[PDB]
Design a protein around this ligand. Structure first.
Ligand SMILES: [Ca+2]
Ligand SMILES: [Ca+2]
Ligand SMILES: [Ca+2]
Ligand SMILES: [Ca+2]
Ligand SMILES: [Cu+2]
Ligand SMILES: [Cu+2]
Lengths: 721, 718
């Protein structure tokens, strides 16, 4: 029997184009580009013919296909984009069965407790050396597949390690004073606790809210203030900021200002309610989904690759041109790019062992009750990988992208598949190079970049990260920010109102009674680069103007001050875009005797004002707890247990357990396994163009080969010799 | 009948045959055509077209009527280009006007026999009249006038012609001004070197056996208050030489420490400077792929089957809410004019005129063949004249529309530049997005319209992109590629004796070759008229201040806002951590905030950033080109102040550019301002950039700031 072609293909997620003049259907789904004419006994998949027992049937203007059409066509094998991995890569993320296995093991322990939750269940990484031997020498990793299982027992954190290969518990270690991150059920609990609160309902009523059932809460970490906030350091708490649901799908546009509840999660109750001046809730409808807008007409534009892609995805390994890397997912930080090599005329040279987002923070600068403690450590306290936002095909990624699914463990230990978790796409990026010598034939080649894109949404903000692989060896890392602004309710409608001046001291008036409170977006990337080997050194090249001592008319010259940076303490610094910072390999040189290196550029530009550091006085606790915010460049000695700029357990942390801690012993960085950390941020002063919803704003970072190669990397294969 | 492939390719269209669907897909600029063999009709940009003669297959070759191209491509179904019945007042001089202007000056008794023309361009009506035409269709009632700058030998003369009335209005010799380098000067230099026995003897000394393989390159000499020993009244050019070894890349074979000074009027070398002898680097280093084989790549296309979202009428481009005029100039290239943003049915002013103002590539080596090296690309060589035709699909994406532009050559004869500018729309990630937990996703794609121009001067090729975002932002990016200017040195590796001295002013990027450090400094002249003529420059500096509102916080994030009242204060360094707005103090958005545009001179770059001029304050290039040391400049609008480096920068003795335009320190309060953005890079070379450099980019941005009342891309309310 048969099924309706359009409805089915759409369900399946494929793009369907019908050409009435050619009597042809063009279907696109990831690596598959298909053409099929009604009644034809064959279809075309990526330029190759595929026989069809049951042809597409056109009946009274509707197309119908066999119930096996989707599988016969899309899983035929003519689309070679994906290939089966034969020997499992040691860095492959835990499978669904491994996740379940790890959970059964801890649950089999005499200490496991019933309400125990899982903040993170991830692969315990094999030793770096073996992983490289597997990637470069294909040597098997004879070390048991293990898993780190971080558990939250009520409010207590416990770390356990399970031996997946032998199915047994290796360690069970409680971690004192550590608080666990915010888990999904905490959101529902806060909403429910607020809904059952008699006092809160009364506080809300005096603030002009009739139906307390329309109040939407949002859970926020309280941070640490040495008690000045009057909060017990031992309790598992969350502060709650509320908004009113007016039915326009954007409760964020209706803040109930100056009302903050403090909820104790173990106690399941509001332990404190801070109330400030009453501010009338902004009620005007401000939808961002277009319900009240006209859909403008736009002509179609598609980027197509009719014969398939230039890259191949074997299991989780991606091969594209000279690049080879492994791509996996972690529930905390998202995507992890591993064992990155660049094939230099037959030899795979190491570039990066492991790269991923280290952590990020969005701190506010308003001192009022509903804002003084507001600082979001999105990955650390919320879990960005778990909050991945499925890619909206053709909108969040170009129409020629391939969308990957990724699996991780939810907070109850059950496997979870995030659909369209990461997008992979090749794109035209202008001329790779060009030279039009006068009177001679032109010379130009196009530039191609391979992009790996991932989006994660935490509350009101959506963040986009692109890991950009340039064909010429350069690696770009861009961070985009969009979503809905966290706003403050104010009495002024315009800057001509009496309280205007005071209402906008900490932010711009972006709408009537609405202020986009100033804040920063600070991202940090953990890049374990291994420049053509493990042992590297940090080198500084500062371009300078020096007096001319060679004679002739010039008074000055352009020279460079080159010097090594021998320790972690001196490597932690601000980044001057006018200078050059290299991670060199003092053991290997290019054809000219120069050390093979990678130039590190933590600041390659951005569309919002740039954050010069943390916009906090040096005596602020957030400033003290999180030193990674104030420096753009950090370099530490490799250690398998140092992966977060903000530290492993940042919720209500009392001291820097991150980059401040990783560099405190000021170790030597001379000819050793170094790990680069790049911090780049923006200082967001709002404007009306960003409300009700903000247009994506981007920040760029870059890693460029510096004398890593001996000539223009994309000139091509040498014809003679 | 006539062969399709042959005819179509000669026409410049792309031909795709699909055997499975028996369909030909033909593409050229905005025309996207589909035609099946034997079919009585074809499709042009999604619309049906009756064919007089069906396409016919003859021995597996398709044939079409001799009128096919005309009936199909010029059918009228391709609406990309529309007829302009009332010519915009900024339209560039046409070929007929150029020839007419030239005949008017030649009819004068003051015209001399071998006079050349450095520039023949339109002399535009007053700004007011042009805006009135763009916004109210009011006719500019002033005859078309042309500025005709002549070079008589070495003497510059400025004339003005009235094109309507066909008469000469003025003829004014310009005292002390030196003319820009003209194309015939290139041949004279090479020829003068060829006929120089002294020179050939110097070349022989340096190991060159065949003086006929010597390639000269002409360079302006700058000004050193006589320290260079050159006469200020003489039209001179210095010459740097290379050896042609047959690899198509003479740049890779410098003849170091040999410089000749040529007097163009005397037509002879007037001075030869000789430094240490350095063997010419000889190894073949082609950049054209003659010695290479590219890896096979699966095909990729960017299709727009229904045609483009933009329309081109004359030179007026309309796309989404934008409207602007695109014209060409021989000195600075493209001019973006009368830019308005259609805000819910009402066209609001954004920019009267924007274009590259000028640029410079100053070097940092003091030696004989480098100390005076400073390329004023547009000003001394003419970037519009040297435009490099776009290589379809490579220099610009495959869905681009390539425009042809016309200018006058140095002899006054119209010169049409094929594929002079590329226009193309491109996907640029999500316009905005919000995925509220457990709710339907909301995302829209971002589209950017790019206007791309490429200019090549000697060894460097420069790419300029004028980017219009749907949300009102305007981006201006400049890319740099080409062949690096290298110095011949004795060291082959950093392990050789002279290596350290050889690399004191640049990196050793190849054996015996050092890419001498230098900077790339661009300056954009943007006569922004934010929602009107009268604007003011406002500074917003984000700062950390002590908390005085109570609570646990010790500090707060606040803004220090203040106006910049004069030209002198407006000439400043740009801190990317601060905000700079060109605001209209007479109009406000719904929230009572002054409608403005945020000026960002530095939005990013792939090469190290130039924080200013890498020259001591007493260097002559420094004193002559003040624009190199400040990233932001704002001056009072004046019709004859268009170049950051001065109108006549060749051997200029002082700043006639931005230093002169702002010298008077005028008021910038509620008045017609002109913004100048200087953005540069400091280039310290690497091996990855030789023999040909991968394109490096810099970005600048102009963002609407409380210009609108909400997200500009949500759409009109139902
Ligand atoms: Ca350390
Ligand atoms: Ca490393
Ligand atoms: Ca203006
Ligand atoms: Ca002035
Ligand atoms: Cu923000
Ligand atoms: Cu350069």
């Amino acid at each position: 029997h048969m099924v309706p072609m359009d409805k089915t293909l759409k369900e399946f997620g494929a793009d369907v184009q019908w050409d009435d003049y050619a009597q042809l259907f063009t279907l696109i789904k990831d690596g598959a580009y298909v053409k099929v004419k009604p009644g034809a006994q064959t279809a075309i998949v990526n330029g190759q013919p595929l026989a069809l027992q049951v042809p597409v049937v056109m009946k009274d203007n509707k197309a119908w296909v066999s119930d096996t059409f989707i599988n016969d066509v899309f899983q035929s094998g003519l689309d070679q984009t994906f290939q089966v991995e034969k020997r499992p890569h040691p860095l492959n993320a835990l499978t669904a069965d491994e996740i379940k296995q790890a959970v059964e093991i801890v649950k089999a322990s005499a200490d496991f407790k019933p309400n125990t939750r899982f903040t993170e269940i991830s692969l315990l990484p094999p030793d770096k050396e073996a992983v490289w031997a597997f990637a470069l020498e294909n040597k098997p990793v004879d070390q048991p597949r293990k898993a780190d299982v971080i558990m939250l027992d009520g409010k207590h954190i416990i770390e356990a390690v399970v031996d997946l290969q032998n199915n047994k518990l290796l360690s069970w270690q409680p971690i004192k004073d550590a608080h666990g991150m915010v888990l999904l059920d905490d959101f529902a609990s806060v909403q429910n606790i607020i809904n059952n609160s008699e006092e809160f309902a009364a506080a809300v009523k005096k603030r002009g809210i009739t139906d307390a059932k329309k109040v939407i809460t949002t859970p926020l970490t309280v941070g640490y203030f040495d008690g000045k906030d009057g909060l017990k350091q031992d309790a598992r708490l969350l502060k709650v900021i509320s908004y009113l649901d007016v039915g326009d799908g954007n409760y964020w546009a209706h803040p109930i200002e100056n009302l903050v509840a403090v909820v104790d999660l173990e106690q399941k109750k509001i332990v404190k309610i801070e109330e400030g001046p009453v501010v009338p809730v902004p009620m005007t409808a401000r939808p961002f989904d277009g319900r009240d807008r006209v859909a403008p007409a736009v002509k179609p534009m598609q980027i197509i690759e009719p014969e398939g892609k230039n890259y191949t995805i074997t299991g989780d390994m991606i091969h594209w041109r000279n690049w080879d890397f492994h791509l996996s997912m972690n529930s905390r930080v998202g995507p992890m790019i591993s064992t990155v090599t660049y094939n230099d005329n037959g030899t795979k040279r190491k570039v990066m062992y492991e790269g991923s987002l280290g952590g990020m923070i969005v701190p506010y600068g308003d001192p009022d009750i509903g804002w003084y403690f507001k600082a979001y450590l999105n990955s650390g306290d919320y879990g960005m990988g778990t909050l991945t936002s499925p890619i909206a095909r053709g909108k969040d990624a170009p129409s020629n992208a391939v969308l990957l699914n990724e699996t991780i463990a939810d907070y109850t230990g059950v496997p979870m598949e995030i659909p369209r978790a990461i997008a992979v796409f090749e794109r035209y990026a202008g001329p790779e190079y060009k030279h039009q010598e006068m009177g001679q034939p032109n010379v130009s080649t196009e530039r191609r970049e391979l992009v790996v894109r991932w989006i994660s949404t935490v509350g009101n903000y959506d963040y986009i990260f692109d890991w950009i692989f340039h064909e010429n060896g350069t690696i770009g890392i861009d961070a985009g920010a969009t979503g809905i602004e966290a706003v403050k309710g104010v009495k002024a409608k315009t800057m001509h109102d009496e309280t205007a001046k005071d209402d906008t001291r900490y932010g711009t008036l972006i709408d009537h009674n609405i202020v986009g409170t100033t804040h920063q977006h600070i991202y940090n990337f953990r890049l374990d680069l291994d420049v053509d080997g493990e042992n590297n050194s940090l080198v500084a090249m500062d371009p300078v103007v020096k007096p001319n001592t060679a004679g002739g008319p010039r008074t000055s010259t352009m020279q460079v001050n080159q010097y090594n940076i021998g320790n972690e303490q001196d490597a932690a610094q601000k980044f001057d875009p006018g200078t050059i910072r290299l991670l060199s390999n003092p053991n290997k040189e290019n054809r000219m005797g120069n050390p093979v290196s990678y130039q590190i550029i933590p600041y390659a530009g951005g569309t919002h004002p740039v954050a010069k550091g943390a916009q906090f006085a040096p005596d602020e606790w957030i400033y003290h707890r999180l030193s990674f915010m104030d420096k753009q460049l950090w370099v530490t000695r490799y250690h398998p247990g140092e992966r977060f700029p903000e530290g492993k357990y940042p919720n209500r942390s009392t001291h820097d357990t991150g980059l401040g801690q990783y560099s405190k012993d000021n170790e030597s960085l001379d000819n050793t396994d170094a790990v680069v950390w790049m911090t780049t941020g923006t200082t967001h002063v709002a404007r009306a163009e960003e409300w009700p919803i903000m247009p994506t704003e981007w920040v760029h970072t870059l890693l460029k080969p510096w004398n890593f190669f001996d000539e223009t990397p994309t000139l091509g294969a040498l014809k003679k010799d």
